[PDB]
Write an enzyme that holds these catalytic residues in place. Structure first.
Site, PDB file in Angstrom:
ATOM      1  N   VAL A 153       3.280  -5.804   3.683  1.00  0.00           N
ATOM      2  CA  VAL A 153       2.708  -6.360   4.184  1.00  0.00           C
ATOM      3  C   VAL A 153       2.578  -7.870   3.993  1.00  0.00           C
ATOM      4  O   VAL A 153       2.295  -8.407   3.056  1.00  0.00           O
ATOM      5  CB  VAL A 153       0.884  -6.096   3.762  1.00  0.00           C
ATOM      6  CG1 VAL A 153      -0.208  -7.252   4.315  1.00  0.00           C
ATOM      7  CG2 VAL A 153       0.731  -4.582   4.080  1.00  0.00           C
ATOM      8  N   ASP A 208     -11.186   5.217   4.762  1.00  0.00           N
ATOM      9  CA  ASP A 208     -10.827   4.506   3.291  1.00  0.00           C
ATOM     10  C   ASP A 208     -11.512   3.548   3.034  1.00  0.00           C
ATOM     11  O   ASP A 208     -10.829   2.340   2.955  1.00  0.00           O
ATOM     12  CB  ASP A 208      -8.806   4.460   3.693  1.00  0.00           C
ATOM     13  CG  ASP A 208      -8.744   4.334   1.904  1.00  0.00           C
ATOM     14  OD1 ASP A 208      -8.957   4.890   1.004  1.00  0.00           O
ATOM     15  OD2 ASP A 208      -7.468   3.499   2.659  1.00  0.00           O
ATOM     16  N   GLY A 265       1.310  -1.015   0.035  1.00  0.00           N
ATOM     17  CA  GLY A 265       0.329  -0.036  -0.151  1.00  0.00           C
ATOM     18  C   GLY A 265       0.421   1.268  -0.335  1.00  0.00           C
ATOM     19  O   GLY A 265       1.922   1.097   0.723  1.00  0.00           O
TER      20      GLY A 265
HETATM   21  N1  LIG Z   1      -5.587  -8.693   7.762  1.00  0.00           N
HETATM   22  C1  LIG Z   1      -5.039  -8.910   6.341  1.00  0.00           C
HETATM   23  N2  LIG Z   1      -4.775 -10.111   5.792  1.00  0.00           N
HETATM   24  C2  LIG Z   1      -4.426 -10.803   4.518  1.00  0.00           C
HETATM   25  N3  LIG Z   1      -4.110 -10.296   3.833  1.00  0.00           N
HETATM   26  C3  LIG Z   1      -4.248  -8.598   4.896  1.00  0.00           C
HETATM   27  C4  LIG Z   1      -4.441  -8.580   5.376  1.00  0.00           C
HETATM   28  N4  LIG Z   1      -4.248  -6.872   5.763  1.00  0.00           N
HETATM   29  C5  LIG Z   1      -3.786  -6.415   4.967  1.00  0.00           C
HETATM   30  N5  LIG Z   1      -3.957  -7.599   3.866  1.00  0.00           N
HETATM   31  C6  LIG Z   1      -2.608  -7.226   2.055  1.00  0.00           C
HETATM   32  O1  LIG Z   1      -1.537  -6.237   2.619  1.00  0.00           O
HETATM   33  C7  LIG Z   1      -2.600  -4.676   1.955  1.00  0.00           C
HETATM   34  C8  LIG Z   1      -1.696  -3.823   2.421  1.00  0.00           C
HETATM   35  O2  LIG Z   1      -2.942  -3.736   3.714  1.00  0.00           O
HETATM   36  P1  LIG Z   1      -2.728  -2.159   4.600  1.00  0.00           P
HETATM   37  O3  LIG Z   1      -1.670  -2.448   4.928  1.00  0.00           O
HETATM   38  O4  LIG Z   1      -3.781  -2.116   5.054  1.00  0.00           O
HETATM   39  O5  LIG Z   1      -3.472  -0.281   3.541  1.00  0.00           O
HETATM   40  P2  LIG Z   1      -1.936   0.149   3.270  1.00  0.00           P
HETATM   41  O6  LIG Z   1      -0.573   0.065   3.621  1.00  0.00           O
HETATM   42  O7  LIG Z   1      -2.748   0.924   1.573  1.00  0.00           O
HETATM   43  O8  LIG Z   1      -2.584   1.752   4.107  1.00  0.00           O
HETATM   44  C9  LIG Z   1      -4.107  -5.252   1.213  1.00  0.00           C
HETATM   45  O9  LIG Z   1      -4.634  -4.534  -0.103  1.00  0.00           O
HETATM   46  C10 LIG Z   1      -3.871  -6.488   1.147  1.00  0.00           C
HETATM   47  O10 LIG Z   1      -3.889  -7.335   0.270  1.00  0.00           O
HETATM   48 MG   LIG Z   2      -4.679  -0.058   2.083  1.00  0.00          MG
END
Ligand SMILES: Nc1ncnc2c1ncn2[C@@H]1O[C@H](COP(=O)(O)OP(=O)(O)O)[C@@H](O)[C@H]1O
Ligand SMILES: [Mg+2]
Ligand SMILES: O=P(O)(O)O[C@H]1[C@H](OP(=O)(O)O)[C@@H](OP(=O)(O)O)[C@H](OP(=O)(O)O)[C@@H](OP(=O)(O)O)[C@H]1OP(=O)(O)O
Ligand SMILES: NCc1ccc(-c2ccoc2)c(Cl)c1
Ligand SMILES: NCc1ccc(-c2ccoc2)c(Cl)c1
Ligand SMILES: NCc1ccc(-c2ccoc2)c(Cl)c1
Ligand SMILES: [Mg+2]
Length: 325
Positions: free
Chosen positions: A51, A154, A46
């Site tokens: 992640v 969001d 993201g």
């Molecule tokens: N609990 C979860 N289980 C599985 N995949 C997840 C989970 N949390 C995040 N992801 C994956 O990681 C990506 C980034 O999530 P997130 O970090 O929360 O948003 P960002 O970095 O955009 O603020 C998600 O779009 C998804 O693909």
């Molecule tokens: Mg996200």
């Protein structure tokens, strides 16, 4: 100046709570040890993190580790405090631990793992019933976080994890979430372009939980009409024009006038004049099996310029569209 506004529901939930609940800057974060976690693979990325899927070696359980990238320390404390406040809520992602990388001084959030089903594989297989079912699960998460004085800010398909096989849904990515304080003027540079409510696009700062209901409406429109995204703006200014091409320009000026919004005069060069379109005009052979009079009535009650006129999450849960769930 603009006319003040407040949420119609859960208005004073933070006012009546102690400083410890909403003062995230004062919150004491206790960082665990990263050694309990072995990273398996990259799951996603993201604008704010990397992640990874991981295994907690103390119980052989799969978890998700969100490694946070260079950002204001205030933002990390806010995301941690909101996640701690909402921990255990229906369909809210569970924060399991917070750990740090000693060497590189990098913070990471540890969550429950969700076996996310692919959107492109899901789209075609999704029935009218499945859309109603999952829309209801998202509403449970939003009614809960709004009742806890939090705006997600969001709401979008990428921030909704679905394990279709187990019919398990989790609302994730609480990095832009904020505590609602009546009369507070918030930063409008939140949400993702296609999901931004008209309040953000006209720079009306006194918004509330209803912002999330607009985003939810955008997701519903995209699902029932199989048009992703529904409002396809190429920039923040064009995003309002895409909304105006559907909801029409007459109701946009009524909204601006109601709140005495000073509309950027550049908009009067790109907005043009557009009639209000009937929701039935988006029905086609590829999507008619997902559309119903109830679905169109529910969508019409979420996609409104006036943030105060939109259904709250609890009102949405009582809509005829959900009688079958
Ligand atoms: N609990 C979860 N289980 C599985 N995949 C997840 C989970 N949390 C995040 N992801 C994956 O990681 C990506 C980034 O999530 P997130 O970090 O929360 O948003 P960002 O970095 O955009 O603020 C998600 O779009 C998804 O693909
Ligand atoms: Mg996200
Ligand atoms: O929904 P589709 O039938 O796939 O059509 C869309 C849509 O075009 P229409 O609205 O005319 O159908 C998009 O146009 P806008 O809504 O954004 O104006 C366009 O997006 P771009 O304008 O950004 O190209 C997109 O193209 P893409 O797939 O590149 O996003 C295109 O999809 P198709 O070309 O597959 O029809
Ligand atoms: N800095 C944002 C913020 C934080 C706390 C409050 C508050 C809550 C209860 O009384 C005042 C308000 Cl009104 C705003
Ligand atoms: N036990 C291996 C390992 C190594 C680094 C990390 C980390 C977490 C946040 O930043 C780095 C984690 Cl979570 C685990
Ligand atoms: N993780 C992508 C994705 C896919 C489908 C949906 C959906 C389907 C019906 O209601 C919501 C959502 Cl919310 C997200
Ligand atoms: Mg997350």
């Amino acid at each position: 100046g603009p006319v003040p506004s407040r949420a119609r529901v859960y208005t004073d939930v933070n006012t009546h709570r102690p400083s410890e609940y909403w003062d995230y800057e004062s919150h004491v974060v206790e960082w665990g040890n990263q050694d309990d976690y072995q990273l398996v693979r990259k799951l996603g990325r993201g604008k704010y993190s990397e992640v990874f899927e991981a295994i907690n070696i103390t119980n052989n359980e799969k978890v998700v580790v969100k490694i946070l990238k260079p950002v204001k320390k205030k933002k990390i404390k806010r995301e941690i405090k909101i996640l701690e406040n909402l921990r255990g809520g229906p369909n809210i992602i569970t924060l399991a631990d917070i750990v740090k990388d000693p060497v590189s001084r990098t913070p990471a959030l540890v969550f429950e793992h969700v076996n996310n089903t692919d959107f492109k594989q899901l789209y075609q297989t999704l029935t009218d019933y499945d859309i109603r079912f999952y829309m209801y699960e998202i509403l449970k998460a939003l009614d809960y976080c709004h009742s806890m004085g939090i705006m997600h800010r969001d709401v979008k398909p990428h921030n909704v994890m679905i394990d279709h096989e187990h019919r398990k849904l989790r609302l994730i990515d609480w990095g832009l979430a904020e505590f609602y304080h009546p009369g507070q003027e918030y930063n409008v540079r939140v949400a993702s372009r296609y999901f931004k409510g008209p309040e953000l696009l006209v720079d009306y700062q006194m918004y509330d939980y209803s912002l999330d209901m607009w985003s939810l409406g955008c997701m519903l429109a995209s699902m029932i009409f199989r048009k992703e995204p529904f409002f396809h703006g190429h920039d923040n200014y064009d995003q309002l024009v895409r909304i105006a091409k559907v909801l029409g320009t007459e109701d946009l000026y009524d909204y601006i006038d109601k709140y005495n919004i000073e509309l950027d005069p550049r908009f009067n060069d790109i907005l043009g004049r557009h009639s209000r379109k009937r929701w039935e005009r988006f029905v086609h052979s590829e999507n008619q099996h997902l559309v119903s009079p109830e679905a169109l009535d529910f969508l019409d009650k979420l996609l409104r310029y006036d943030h105060q006129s939109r259904l709250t999450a609890r009102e949405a849960m009582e809509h005829p569209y959900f009688y079958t769930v």
